[PDB]
RNA sequence: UGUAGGAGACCGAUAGCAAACAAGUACCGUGAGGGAAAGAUGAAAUAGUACUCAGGAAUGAGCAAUUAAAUAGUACCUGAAA
RNA sequence: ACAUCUCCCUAGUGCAGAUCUUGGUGGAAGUAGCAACUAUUCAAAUGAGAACUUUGAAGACUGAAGUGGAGAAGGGUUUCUU
RNA sequence: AAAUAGAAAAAAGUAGGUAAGGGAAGUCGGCAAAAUAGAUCCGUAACUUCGGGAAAAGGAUUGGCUCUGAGGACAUUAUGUU
RNA sequence: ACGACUUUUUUGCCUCAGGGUGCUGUAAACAUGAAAGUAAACUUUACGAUCUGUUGAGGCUUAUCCCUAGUGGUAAAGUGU
């Protein structure tokens, strides 16, 4: 959600000359004296955000599991990790249970409930067909600009201190 | 302005003499009054 | 009645608004707070407390006031805020 | 409402109206004064004062001209000046003329050098 | 025309002299000048709204009270339409 | 104070309209709006009632081409106390 | 104190800022905005009525600190006071 | 924008505080420290931008950051059917 907004940022359109006597943001010319209405098909002020949307074909990289001690672990990096971020995800801490790691993208905000459904019809695209083989997953801060990946390699990192 | 003549400044007093509001006792047996800023002598 | 001593974050509650209006919203919000609190329709503010929040003029309130609170009915109820000095926040606890 | 007493106040004090003080308390007493001979006698007792001044300090202009006599100051971009507007040009001629004929005046004068010397000179 | 009379198949307060009145006034224009709005309680106010209660004060109400009449209460006749 | 159809003279005699004249009044509407000039706060007093009265404490501004002193024109008791 | 106050903080408006890579290719029009700008030291063309052009163009430097050097007035015959 | 919406109202929630994550960049203070020189003793004592040490220090980090049933809190009692 971000409130209603103007013609620019809810549809894109572009801006009116420098020139312009009330306004570089205001609207697009309507027109038409016949017929005598304004055509719905203009864009105009009012919500962005807050919309229905179905995302779909969204690839499942990994699917994580509370149980497992190396959840976003690899093979390639053996080191203790869990999905949970440096100091936990912004706004959502810890990741208390299994979860899973989709491609890419997401409609709405985080905190926001997400339903996933099967595609309507099987798949049978090479992407689809595909195994990951995953080589890393980052654990860096996000709160800050991510510079360390786990609480122990900050102890080692720095050593002493008051 | 400051400086004034005799004429003027009798007139000014009796002006300021006049403007006074009506008497109650003569009231028990009408009024035209000046206010400065709105309405001006004239003179 | 009761004398309780409390810390106001300050900068939390006047976070949102400009130079200009930052220290009127600074008292108005410990109005607010210890009213709240006490849950009181008056609240008395300190002289003390009041210049304390003023001293660094409308750009720079205190970010972080300790404030004693003391709910006393003699309806005549009412809430005297005043500020306790203090050094260090660290470790400080919302107790009587 | 004090504006009388403070009208009356200022003349007493002979001070600035934004410099009385009237004391918070007696202040029916204070408001109560409707002379000059009253707003003495308030100002005697000392329940009318003029303020200490807010009057500034010469102290940082002392070690800044004290900074200025040790020349620290007077480089390039502490100019904005031309070097005539610095140090006029009039006044480094006459004090050169002026210091040599006080000179040569008094080096004929005292017999030290001759008369068609000094007209050279 | 000024003053004094007598008049009327005249007008009856947006009419009629600009003026039924504290009008050639108020007010406006640098000034020459321009120039209004503006009558009605009742028989009698030497009948003008007493008194009480509730009201900070305005005021309201009264089992209280003048008058034949107060939804006649002095910006008072009747009181149309919007 | 009112009528006259019994008859007849007389008329400034019949309004929806003139972007009529004059006066009142709506819908528009609790809306347009109350947008120059950095900022006020705390406590008290007054009083029936205080953001904008008064006092005190803070914070600030005008910044000597001053919201400062004096004066002219012009105004004319605006002064001042109650 | 300004003909108001409070609360909120999106559009939109208005007075402002700031922007990667490009650099007038937008638009009648570089309009707007920005770049430039003070001093000292250098350096300065076409052209000219020889007076100018000219701050041309084009460069460099500029803080803080601790010093070094230069510039007076008085009175002892080379020395002092300041 | 405001309605409206998402919520929670004692196995919580708010409040601060602590801890985490960070962001900034090494605080004040003191040194029988050094430092271009200065003045005053015959190598010491006065003065001195500054730099170094104590010192990855000091500050700031929830408002729309994270964790903690850690502190203290947690009211009106109103209205429609």
Excluded at chain 3, 20 to 39: C, F
Excluded at chain 4, 16 to 39: H, Q, T, V, Y
Excluded at chain 4, 74 to 99: E, F, H
């Amino acid at each position: 959600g971000h409130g209603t907004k103007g013609v620019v940022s809810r549809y894109g359109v572009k801006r009116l000359p420098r020139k312009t006597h009330r306004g570089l943001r205001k609207v697009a010319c309507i027109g038409a004296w016949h017929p005598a209405r304004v055509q719905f098909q203009i864009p105009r002020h009012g919500q962005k955000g807050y919309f229905h949307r179905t995302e779909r074909n969204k690839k499942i990289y990994r699917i994580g599991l509370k149980t497992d001690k190396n959840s976003a672990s690899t093979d390639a990096d053996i080191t203790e990790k869990k999905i949970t971020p440096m100091g936990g995800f912004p706004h959502y801490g810890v990741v208390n249970e299994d979860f899973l790691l989709l491609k890419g993208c997401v409609a709405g905000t985080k905190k926001r409930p997400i339903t996933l459904r099967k595609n309507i019809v099987p798949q049978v695209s090479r992407d689809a067909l595909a195994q990951v083989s995953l080589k890393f997953i980052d654990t860096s801060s996000k709160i800050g600009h991510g510079r360390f990946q786990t609480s122990e390699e900050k102890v080692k990192y720095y050593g002493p201190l008051k | 302005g400051s400086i004034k003549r005799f004429r003027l400044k009798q007139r000014l007093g009796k002006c300021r003499r006049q403007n006074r509001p009506v008497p109650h006792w003569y009231r028990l047996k009408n009024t035209k009054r000046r206010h400065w800023r709105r309405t001006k002598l004239g003179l | 009645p009761v004398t309780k001593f409390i810390t106001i974050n300050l900068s939390k509650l006047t976070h949102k608004v400009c130079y200009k209006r930052k220290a009127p919203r600074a008292i108005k919000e410990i109005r607010s707070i210890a009213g709240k609190l006490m849950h009181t329709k008056d609240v008395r503010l300190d002289v003390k407390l009041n210049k304390f929040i003023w001293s660094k003029g409308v750009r720079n309130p205190p970010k972080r006031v300790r404030v004693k609170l003391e709910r006393k009915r003699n309806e005549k109820m009412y809430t005297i805020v005043e500020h306790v000095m203090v050094d260090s926040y660290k470790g400080l606890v919302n107790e009587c | 409402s004090l504006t009388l007493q403070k009208r009356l106040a200022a003349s007493v004090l002979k001070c600035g109206k934004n410099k009385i003080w009237m004391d918070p308390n007696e202040i029916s007493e204070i408001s109560l004064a409707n002379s000059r001979f009253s707003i003495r006698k308030l100002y005697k007792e000392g329940l009318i004062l003029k303020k200490p001044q807010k009057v500034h300090s010469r102290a940082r202009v002392r070690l800044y001209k004290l900074a200025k006599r040790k020349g620290r100051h007077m480089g390039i971009g502490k100019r904005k000046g031309t070097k005539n507007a610095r140090t006029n040009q009039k006044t480094l001629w006459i004090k050169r003329q002026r210091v040599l004929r006080r000179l040569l005046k008094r080096l004929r004068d005292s017999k030290k050098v001759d008369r068609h010397l000094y007209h050279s000179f």
